[PDB]
Write an enzyme that holds these catalytic residues in place. Structure first.
Site, PDB file in Angstrom:
ATOM      1  N   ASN A  35      68.237  36.403 -16.534  1.00  0.00           N
ATOM      2  CA  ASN A  35      67.552  37.689 -16.580  1.00  0.00           C
ATOM      3  C   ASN A  35      66.174  37.543 -15.987  1.00  0.00           C
ATOM      4  OD1 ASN A  35      69.308  39.384 -18.735  1.00  0.00           O
ATOM      5  ND2 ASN A  35      69.021  37.268 -19.513  1.00  0.00           N
ATOM      6  N   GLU A  78      60.635  49.435 -25.849  1.00  0.00           N
ATOM      7  CA  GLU A  78      60.873  49.119 -24.447  1.00  0.00           C
ATOM      8  C   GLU A  78      61.424  50.367 -23.754  1.00  0.00           C
ATOM      9  OE1 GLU A  78      64.177  46.433 -23.706  1.00  0.00           O
ATOM     10  OE2 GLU A  78      62.904  45.253 -22.383  1.00  0.00           O
ATOM     11  N   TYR A  80      62.613  52.539 -19.927  1.00  0.00           N
ATOM     12  CA  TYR A  80      63.134  52.470 -18.571  1.00  0.00           C
ATOM     13  C   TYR A  80      63.280  53.870 -17.982  1.00  0.00           C
ATOM     14  CZ  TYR A  80      65.102  47.671 -19.124  1.00  0.00           C
ATOM     15  OH  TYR A  80      65.294  46.322 -19.291  1.00  0.00           O
ATOM     16  N   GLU A 172      64.736  44.597 -11.825  1.00  0.00           N
ATOM     17  CA  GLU A 172      65.366  43.792 -12.879  1.00  0.00           C
ATOM     18  C   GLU A 172      66.716  43.290 -12.409  1.00  0.00           C
ATOM     19  OE1 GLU A 172      65.370  45.268 -16.935  1.00  0.00           O
ATOM     20  OE2 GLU A 172      66.988  43.921 -17.482  1.00  0.00           O
TER      21      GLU A 172
END
EC number: 3.2.1.8
Length: 185
Positions: A35, A78, A80, A172
């Protein structure tokens, strides 16, 4: 107000060749990764920021995201805003949709346990997602009017924390290979 922060985090294997370029520009070339998140943005995120970017190269080979990426604390969240991906479109628990910057996004929430965060390797937090229903075209100047996502998230009971950590326009990858080239401002 131009970028002041460089993100280059990797974990779990493979190669991630990230270049911190001129201005808001960066490039990533990666292979057989674990990752990683690489991007440019701001040390302190704002719910009022319009993020500008141009992905000159979006070439994931497998699972990568071209996405706004950031955190709050108080509490730990978090978030996105995913504009493009490769072979895997990320989702979670469906809440609704939001239209912003010429795109329709599905809104998702996910609670993460025993997971890595900006606080450490074994933590609990919630994730908020806007994921575009179809891949955003690249190579042209793009905006993410992040307030539109903050406001929509709020309307579905998804409130962000009050202590703002970083906010980046990211590449990512998860267990993938690929290339990107992105400029952020």
């Amino acid at each position: 107000a131009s970028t002041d922060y460089w993100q280059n985090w990797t974990f779990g294997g493979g190669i991630v060749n990230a270049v911190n370029g001129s201005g808001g520009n960066y490039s990533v070339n990666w292979s057989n990764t674990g990752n990683f998140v690489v991007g440019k943005g701001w040390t302190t995120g704002s719910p009022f920021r319009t993020i500008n970017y141009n992905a000159g190269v979006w070439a994931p080979n497998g699972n990568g995201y071209l996405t706004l990426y950031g955190w709050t604390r108080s509490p730990l969240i978090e978030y996105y805003v995913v504009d493009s991906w490769g072979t895997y479109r990320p989702t979670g628990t469906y809440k609704g949709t939001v239209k912003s910057d010429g795109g329709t996004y599905d809104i998702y929430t996910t609670t993460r346990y025993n997971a890595p965060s900006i606080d450490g390797d074994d933590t609990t937090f919630t994730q908020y997602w806007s994921v575009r229903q179809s891949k955003r075209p690249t190579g042209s100047n793009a905006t993410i009017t992040f307030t539109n996502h903050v406001n929509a998230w709020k309307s579905h009971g998804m409130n962000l924390g009050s202590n703002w950590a970083y906010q980046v326009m990211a590449t990512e990858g998860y267990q993938s290979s690929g290339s990107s080239n992105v400029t952020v401002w």
